[PDB]
Write a protein that binds this ligand. Structure first.
Ligand SMILES: Nc1ncnc2c1ncn2[C@@H]1O[C@H](CSCC[C@H](N)C(=O)O)[C@@H](O)[C@H]1O
Ligand SMILES: CN(C)CCOC(c1ccccc1)c1ccccc1
Length: 288
């Protein structure tokens, strides 16, 4: 079997299906609407510039949501929003979104096409550690090799009253049950590792950092996955399993087992015939 990651065209089509077949971004929009204001409400105090470091910012959708809340809290204050993103393709879409969006006149953007570890090394030999007011790592720690080192390093870059936000799937999510039970059966690329809030809270406790973790229910419409030959269903099958052409390349036995479990309460909830996979997210806020 081939991991969905070794086929950009596939991964992109699969992912796109995901965002359009779940409450991922809405769930986050809810957090940004009801929680973020209180979280970043004092990060700009006493400053004439608010520095925001986006790690794994991707295409910029969530980043702008965040920018909107900081501006609302600090009218007229200049914002330096730097992005660390290894994908040239993502960076291009990000810049495109910025141009097509209004009310961003007070924000300065800067994109660094590198990974978070490459950014770290590039900074360490600068023998001048810069400070940031808000650092966020949204749904990207899966792609980081050394997580504890990453957490300690970026936490060391937090300035006065600064905060760091990390988002990953919750240990109570369906993904957690999925990876525990079928993880070994799925393809394995050294380009990613399974991570849940459980892993991060253990690491944070051991690092001795101060933090708070909040979970918000989120679902993934897996209904269509049941209909044979269905377009949306199969696309979502590849995603969920992180494999190219699952409903056609995966052993018939594995397909049956998994197909049944996805129906179990541990993984999903059957509401109005609609099958909703548990995509609960965890939002972790670390203090300077
Ligand atoms: N080692 C690494 N360091 C930083 N970003 C990385 C990375 N490996 C992958 N990424 C980036 O991590 C992102 C994961 S998808 C992230 C979603 C984005 N933050 C938003 O919520 O929509 C992609 O844009 C990807 O290219
Ligand atoms: C992050 N959300 C979208 C949950 C699904 O996570 C997935 C995932 C991410 C991208 C594409 C398919 C599946 C994952 C697989 C392996 C290692 C780490 C994560």
């Amino acid at each position: 079997m081939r991991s969905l990651f070794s086929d950009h065209g596939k991964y992109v089509e699969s992912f796109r299906r995901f965002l359009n077949h779940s409450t991922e971004h809405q769930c986050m929009q809810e957090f940004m609407d009801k929680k973020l204001p209180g979280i970043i409400g004092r990060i700009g105090d006493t400053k004439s510039e608010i520095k925001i470091l986006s790690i794994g910012g991707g295409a910029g959708e969530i980043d702008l949501q965040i920018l909107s809340k900081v501006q609302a809290q600090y009218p007229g204050v200049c914002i330096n929003n730097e992005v660390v993103e290894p994908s040239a393709e993502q960076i291009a879409k990000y810049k495109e979104l910025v141009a097509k969006t209004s009310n961003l006149e007070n924000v300065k953007f800067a994109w660094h096409k590198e990974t978070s570890s490459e950014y770290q090394s590039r900074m360490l030999e600068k023998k001048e550690l810069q400070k940031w007011d808000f650092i966020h790592m949204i749904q990207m720690l899966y792609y980081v090799k050394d997580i504890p080192a990453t957490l300690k390093f970026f936490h060391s870059l937090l300035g006065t009253n600064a905060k760091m936000l990390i988002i990953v799937v919750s240990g109570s999510s369906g993904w957690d049950k999925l990876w525990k039970k079928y993880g070994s059966r799925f393809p394995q690329d050294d380009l990613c590792q399974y991570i849940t809030s459980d892993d991060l809270t253990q690491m944070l406790d051991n690092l001795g950092l101060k933090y708070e973790c909040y979970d918000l229910l989120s679902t993934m419409d897996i209904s269509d996955c049941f209909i044979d030959g269905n377009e949306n269903g199969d696309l979502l099958w590849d995603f969920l399993t992180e494999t190219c052409n699952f409903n056609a390349t995966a052993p018939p036995d594995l397909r049956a087992e998994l197909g049944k479990d996805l129906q179990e309460p541990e993984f999903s909830a059957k509401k109005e015939g609609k099958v909703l996979f548990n995509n609960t997210l965890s939002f972790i806020v670390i203090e300077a």
